[PDB]
From TrEMBL:
The gene is BnaCnng52810D. It is found in: Endoplasmic reticulum membrane. It comes from Brassica napus. This is O-acyltransferase. Belongs to the membrane-bound acyltransferase family. Sterol o-acyltransferase subfamily. The lineage of its organism: Eukaryota, Viridiplantae, Streptophyta, Embryophyta, Tracheophyta.
């Protein structure tokens, strides 16, 4: 519901629900290691 991204090319939404917890959302940091 919180779609306020219009200043770049966002791959996918980290979360679009009240009770969600995807993996890719954390993978963003996994790239660091």
């Amino acid at each position: 519901n919180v779609d306020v991204r219009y200043t770049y090319r966002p791959s996918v939404p980290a979360h679009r629900r009240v009770r969600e917890s995807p993996l890719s959302s954390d993978a963003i940091f996994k790239q660091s290691h």
